[PDB]
């Protein structure tokens, strides 16, 4: 009935939020590399490699999630639905994890640049959201494990629904984290030249 269709629908929404967030992240990454060049602030080469590596990965994940979304929608238009819905939660969780590493690298970038050019309020906010997301990601990992285990051998439906709440909270918290790093970049640029 409408329970599973409603879950596939919300997963479409969540993948859209992740695409949008990725777009903003891209902007922030670009802005930092640009400021890095102008400010001149080997340890940055390896950061640039991690940025690029995790950015490829996020692009893969987004793509694979798009493919899985389509199949899931086909399965509704037409067991394998449950399986795919659970696989679609693992894809979204992975994307959130890779985006979180990316965010953390951008935060690092901002800290390096601000130690060349208050921020204590900013720091406190960064840590609060970082700790929260770390904990939401961890709860999502445990629920994913539980849901995968059940799917091999309901409890399943409950944890599937609970996993939708987990992912949504993590994204909403990432949104806040993004706004803070945007704030940080704007605050740094406003001080050069």
């Amino acid at each position: 009935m409408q329970l599973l269709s409603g879950i596939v629908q919300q997963q479409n929404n969540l993948l859209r939020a992740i695409e949008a967030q990725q777009h903003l992240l891209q902007l922030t990454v670009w802005g930092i590399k640009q400021l890095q060049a102008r400010i001149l602030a080997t340890t940055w080469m390896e950061w640039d490699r991690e940025i690029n590596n995790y950015t490829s990965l996020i692009h893969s994940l987004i793509e694979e999630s798009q493919n899985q979304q389509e199949k899931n929608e086909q399965e509704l238009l037409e067991g394998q639905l449950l399986s795919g819905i659970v696989q679609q939660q693992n894809n979204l969780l992975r994307a959130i994890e890779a985006q979180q590493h990316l965010l953390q690298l951008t935060v690092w970038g901002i800290k390096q640049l601000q130690a060349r050019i208050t921020w204590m309020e900013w720091d406190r906010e960064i840590n609060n959201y970082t700790s929260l997301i770390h904990s939401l990601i961890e709860e999502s990992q445990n629920q994913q494990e539980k849901n995968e285990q059940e799917l091999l051998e309901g409890q399943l439906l409950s944890g599937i629904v609970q996993q939708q709440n987990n992912l949504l909270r993590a994204i909403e918290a990432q949104q806040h984290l993004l706004q803070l790093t945007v704030w940080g970049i704007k605050q740094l640029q406003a001080r050069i030249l």
Partner: antibody
Amino acid sequence: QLVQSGAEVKKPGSSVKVSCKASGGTFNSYAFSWVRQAPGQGLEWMGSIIPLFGFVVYAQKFQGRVTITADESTSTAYMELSSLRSEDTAVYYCARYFDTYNNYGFANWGQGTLVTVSS
Amino acid sequence: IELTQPPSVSVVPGQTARISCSGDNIPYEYASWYQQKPGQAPVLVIYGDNNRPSGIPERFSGSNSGNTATLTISGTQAEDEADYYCASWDSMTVDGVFGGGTKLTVLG
């Protein structure tokens, strides 16, 4: 989407400010470059601005002689080139990249503005 | 960092045209391609490495081995006659660069 101000005819030594109006999208989510093309010649990257941050970055070739700004309330990107000389005669395009999260290419281009530098 | 393309390529109409663009390290998804006709703005034909934007004919394709971006046009048509450019960014300082361009001639 991207409409530029019209052809300019300039004396050597003077300045030109070329504008580019963007419509249809959210201005803060844009990435802009300026690109010039001398007649019969190739395309040449001049600089970038991400309006959300509002700071411009330049190819060293044009460092110190080009200023790139953006205005949120008019949805306009600008390119000023100073101390003009004859080899600056070219068509100048504003272009937009980061169309989507993975589009590093320039998805939209304005029509170009002809700048003619002559005595 | 320099992108280098052949000054010119010539194709029999219906055959496949290939335009290469060599660089040091074109990172994956950084190569884009542009069509330009006399008197007109450039037009994005490939981005990422193999992505066609909406409205771009299926006969356009791209690839990137890291050292060479290639534009391919299978079944080249009259209207495919134009100049083509590749673009990319420097990995570290994010400057844009274009290839020198390639004049593609459709024979007939």
